[PDB]
Write a protein that binds this ligand. Structure first.
Ligand code: HDD
Ligand code: HDD
Lengths: 725, 725
């Protein structure tokens, strides 16, 4: 059944996106190893050269047919082979996660830059030569496992560290705050953003009444709403967003000192987002774009890398800010508390089976290790309850830690027994302590500088038993205002556009008005611009609302913008090349090698599949058609010279350019490809963000790569409004 | 928290789409009832004027906060109010259906046109004035419960009939055959179409290697693949598709006579599908399009209506065709066996809670009633095992019939006891029979003409215990060819396009080639047109493969086409009206009056939200912006006159028309709106499919509504290649 030439099989070496069929990671990259990947070997199952069997090991002779009385007769109950095969199929599904149901995962490793023993006894942070295997799952939040990747939403960034002293799960998002203050409200907020209960619409979207109804009645939400309405809400890929733990946690060192910490992930590839029209159209054209992007970067060797960083605050400075450190709706500005680099995480192999490794992974922020501890952040405090509880249904019982991807790689022993799906066969004569019949093994371990038992930091607690929000949490507008003022002008316009779009889908007009009132508490310019888009007029009262105070003297912080401080990086990005039937082969040599030299991938597109032949007879393999792989999926578009008449009349080829133009992407036109300038209305003397020359040689590719480094051509935003695209 | 004017709350009368927020069915249409809807009253839970409580009935004072030791202190374990609330949240999800996970449902009623008691003793078909409540779920097949509606896929059409003599579930699809012959292969086929197991891509799409690998190796699949690749695979609405039971079943009359029968649903709104570009973009712009359209049609009074129809074959004619009646890859052409009309089904109320009624509903083709019976169809035979089995995990146990949506409205009594979540409290002293202690109640009932026990038709069985496919099943090409030749030239082109598009995404080129080889065994013109798009050249041998035989002398059957015989019905369709800031109210009057007379809905669109005022002071609320509700979501576009300069250079307004044009929709341009003819290159003297006049009037509306009756403008196809849209 395989073809003789063995081309059914992907090469076991790094290859760029689209070159080879994708594969299970252990087959694609058998030589990429780590302690966790190695320890999964006992459950990995081959196939080649094995007989097909039942689950009981009985070889199957005919897997095409049910047993029946007569070849046209009824199927017999004694067909155990049929019923086993159908039984397992009938029971394949398990409940999806209540939130972050949609997510894409990979294996990798972490290493600290230096020992952090002065501030934390955490073993995984003790030695730069200690490597910790990780498993990372990125996700959206609202939509089901089957929803689209490039929605507007918060993203989840969850890291499972398999340390020598326990599993540590760092379960964060791509924004430094959350929507709400106390975990008791999580079911209200989530129910409000999720599909509405009567009809289960809309999937993967905040643009509906219930969401904006809740936000309008709960101003503590406005901060994370600002983030989600910005281009933060539509990242280019999981490799180009930030990660944050949100909560203040504690580090505890061997001398018992507690230091407050907020965790950060910095993307080594830089920050980059889509624009809204492109993100939405991409949910239709490739609802798996981020999942795909991740898997292929790893197959290509473009491993996603992230730097772990810590904002660190002395215990004595707990009360030194305008906001409460325990309030998860407040960020800590980096101008006030810098991020200190701690180490590097590299994601470098895909899983083998998505269901087994990704769908069944269980992350929980209560999974800490000696050297870390909690705080009283009332959102974190409730999360600690939820993540253990939900697994009892999602993964079928209390033995979810024995599902292979979840297993510690370090020793685990205790007196816990039984439960559904129990794999470990305990030989301990004792199932209780204290016992004498096994000399009290396994034994408690006192806390200590290394390898000691967990002891909680002895924080003083003092108060009455109350259901009460701290008055210090009662401020809602200054952080939103701070984020707003830190954005570039084009970022601010995209925020205005995000609010305007979402609220336009709110059927009850009074809800729109109520959100607009809330915006007028943040910044009059924002509020007016959204109001104009909604045909709403601010009242004189709303026009006169005093802006909220700066945050400890800050009127902006540029670390809050995606783009204010360029951190571009082109490796792993992709360029569409629009071919014609007589391509100038010199243009193409110059184009492909320049891209290759910077780790930029290329996709050769035409009006059909198969091949075309260049001017000098080079045979050019076609990756996809113009309609099949639209500009949505690339970072820039290059048109080499040749017989342009071949495609000049192709509506798809023209539309390819107009869509890429509208979404602010670098375009380069060589030789007669400048005839396309008329489609995108480009002036004779040229325009910034359009590379043009007689040929693809000299500075042509360097100028294109310079545009790609800056991600998008923001200066084009005034010009795109005329284009009907 | 509600506004002053009561306008938080939807009018409880029929209203057009967008006029009111959508609502739970019993609040929207409280006067719409049937025996099943009434019987759900014991579990309906209101809310107005009630106190907020725990599930144990304890009133909550503060639903905003966890219990903590001091207002910035840790959350306490004794907070049972938080933990019940979070526990319930943490366990909301249940396993989605293995297949048909994505779906949308409604209540309604069925009734036969005349008594069928000469051919069946089934009670629900016995009396033209006896009404049977139904609950219908429409679905896709491949994607998850959060995947998009307007994918290319087969659709499911499952009807639960709550009869006086038992639940009958008629569990069909929107094409008259399935992909495979024997149930034993179902996990192989479904796994091949589903997302691939390494990376869980792609969602909701057949366009990937594993699917086309299976197809190319299993030519029995080609017939349903033809239907999937045609515009059947992308219906406009669940109201405008056909439904079929696929299998041959039996009708058994009071005298014991068996008649073989295939079941049909005929949509009274006519057959109508999208075009591919539109359908794929619509998965991004509104992934809930079909769910929404169905809910809104019901809210508006455009109740979906279907005619049940039977193809009837006497028992002595079982072998008289050149295909096997028991082969679910073969259709019975209506030219050979006509569909007899049987009754009418009306869907007239939406559910109250999607999860409780739609997600928990359980349909199963084994749920038959006396007067129906099965056949030896080897696909149907294995389905009977799977639907009972799968419910055990999906719905948590064997008491799934006690979940309120699934409960029979007729009596049910037996000796079965216990099981998880047992609701029924049995008083019977006996739990076994035979018993004396309850005088053997409840008792067996002998079979008879009405109110009788179920007895299987005593079919003769003769053969050895074999796992063997019937030789009569081993023909794969003649039904694909019949379907091909029965399609109009534009439908054939769209089929070619669908194959070409899917296969272009297959990475392994030998798989494309093998599928083209298969096409060459169906029809050369089809094989060559697919080959050309793939840059593949047919071999001499392939050009010489003899066409498969006609199906019992048939060279075409026009009933297999969506469009060859007009049957268009505009009621419930929708028109976009592109507003300007000085709308000519005389045009608007004439438009809305003619639309209203045919039950066609309108949406008023503009370049922002809020209101515009017409030339006569009429205040017009704006339903959506041009960008926010694209032409994808309407059936036609009208541009009234007025201040055209307002929108004449708006890129979104121009693009709206270019998109609707590309997708073959009727466009009407009044007065100066005729200037837009420029963006779409219409001849001065006009074009069939573009309605133009000095004003919108009687004749102008007529022309537009005639075009809408014909669904799309197929004659414009040659012209859409040039437009860059
Ligand atoms: C008390 C309820 C609750 C609250 C207040 C939070 N979550 Fe959570 N979260 C859950 C209850 C939960 C959960 C129900 O327990 C999930 C779903 C399924 C699972 O395994 O854990 C979950 C999943 C989940 C995942 C997916 C993990 C994975 O990939 O499997 C991420 C990344 C987060 N959450 C992160 C957050 C962040 C950054 C929060 C605010 C700071 C947050 N959660 C608040
Ligand atoms: C032997 C396995 C098997 C085979 C051969 C089939 N199916 Fe099936 N089908 C299932 C096993 C199944 C299932 C696993 O049992 C589902 C999923 C969960 C459930 O409740 O039923 C299902 C669900 C399902 C639904 C969704 C009902 C709902 O909305 O809940 C429809 C409409 C169909 N099927 C129709 C078909 C048709 C028309 C088939 C071929 C003629 C077919 N199935 C072959």
């Amino acid at each position: 059944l395989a073809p003789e030439d063995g081309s059914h099989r992907p090469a076991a070496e790094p290859t760029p996106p689209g070159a080879q069929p994708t594969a299970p990671g252990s087959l694609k990259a058998p030589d990429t190893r780590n302690e966790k990947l190695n320890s999964l070997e006992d459950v990995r199952k081959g196939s080649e050269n094995y007989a097909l069997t039942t689950n009981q090991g009985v070889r199957i002779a005919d897997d095409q047919n049910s047993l029946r009385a007569g070849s046209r007769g009824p199927t017999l109950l004694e067909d155990f082979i049929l019923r086993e095969k159908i039984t397992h199929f009938d029971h394949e599904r398990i409940p999806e996660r209540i939130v972050h149901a949609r997510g894409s995962a990979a294996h990798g490793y972490f290493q600290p830059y230096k020992s952090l023993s002065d501030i934390t006894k955490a073993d995984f942070l003790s030695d730069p030569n200690k490597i910790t295997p990780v498993f990372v799952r990125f996700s959206t939040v609202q939509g089901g496992a089957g929803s689209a990747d490039t929605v507007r939403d918060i993203r989840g960034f969850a890291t499972k560290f398999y340390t020598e002293e326990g599993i540590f799960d760092l379960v964060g998002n791509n924004t430094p705050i959350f929507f709400i203050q106390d975990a008791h409200k999580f079911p209200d907020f989530v129910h409000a953003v999720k599909p509405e209960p009567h009809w289960a619409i809309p999937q993967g979207q905040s643009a509906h009444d219930t969401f904006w109804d809740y936000v309008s009645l709960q101003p503590e939400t406005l901060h994370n709403v600002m983030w989600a309405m910005s281009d933060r809400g539509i990242p280019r890929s999981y490799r180009t967003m930030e990660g944050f733990g949100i909560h203040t946690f504690r580090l505890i060192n061997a001398e018992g000192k507690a230091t407050f910490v907020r965790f950060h992930w910095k993307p080594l590839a830089g920050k980059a987002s889509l624009v809204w029209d492109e993100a939405q159209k991409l949910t239709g054209r490739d609802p798996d774009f981020h999942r795909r992007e991740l898997w292929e970067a790893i197959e290509a060797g473009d491993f996603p890398e992230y730097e772990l960083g810590f904002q660190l605050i002395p215990e004595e400075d707990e009360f030194k800010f305008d906001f409460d450190l325990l309030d998860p709706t407040k960020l800590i500005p980096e101008e006030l508390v810098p991020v200190q680099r701690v180490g590097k995480m590299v994601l470098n192999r895909n899983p083998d089976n998505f269901f087994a490794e990704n769908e069944q992974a269980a992350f929980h922020p209560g999974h800490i290790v000696p050297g870390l501890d909690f705080t009283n952040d009332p959102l974190l405090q409730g999360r600690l309850f939820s993540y253990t509880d939900t697994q009892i249904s999602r993964l079928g019982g209390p033995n979810f830690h024995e599902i292979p991807i979840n297993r510690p790689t370090c020793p685990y022993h205790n007196f816990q027994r039984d439960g559904m799906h129990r794999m470990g066969i305990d030989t301990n004569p004792a199932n209780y302590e204290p016992n004498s019949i096994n000399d009290n093994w396994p034994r408690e371990t006192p806390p200590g500088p290394k390898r000691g038992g967990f002891e909680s930091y002895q924080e003083r607690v003092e108060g009455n038993k109350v259901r009460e929000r701290s008055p210090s949490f009662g401020e809602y507008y200054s952080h939103p205002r701070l984020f707003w003022l830190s954005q570039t002008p084009f970022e601010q316009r995209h925020i205005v556009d995000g609010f305007s779009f979402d609220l336009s889908k709110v059927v009850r007009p009074y809800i729109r008005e109520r959100v607009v009132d809330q915006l007028a508490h943040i910044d009059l310019t924002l509020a007016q611009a959204v109001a104009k888009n909604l045909g709403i007029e601010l009242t004189d009262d709303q026009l006169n609302i005093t802006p909220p105070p700066d945050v400890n003297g800050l009127k902006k912080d540029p670390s809050l913008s995606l783009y204010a401080i360029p951190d571009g990086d082109v490796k792993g990005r992709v360029v569409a090349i629009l071919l014609n039937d007589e391509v100038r082969s010199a243009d193409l040599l110059a184009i492909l090698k320049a891209l290759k030299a910077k780790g930029v991938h290329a996709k050769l597109l035409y009006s059909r599949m198969g091949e075309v032949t260049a001017d000098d007879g080079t045979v050019l393999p076609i990756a996809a058609t113009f309609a099949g792989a639209p500009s949505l999926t690339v970072d820039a578009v290059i048109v080499p010279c040749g017989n342009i008449a071949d495609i000049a009349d192709n509506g798809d080829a023209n539309y390819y350019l107009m869509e890429a133009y509208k979404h602010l992407k670098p375009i380069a036109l060589a030789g007669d490809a400048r005839k396309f300038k008329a489609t995108i209305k480009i002036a004779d003397q040229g325009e910034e963000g359009i590379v043009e020359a007689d040929s693809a040689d000299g500075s042509f590719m360097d100028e294109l790569l310079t545009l790609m480094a800056a991600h998008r051509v923001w200066s084009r935003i005034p010009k795109i409004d005329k284009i009907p695209a």
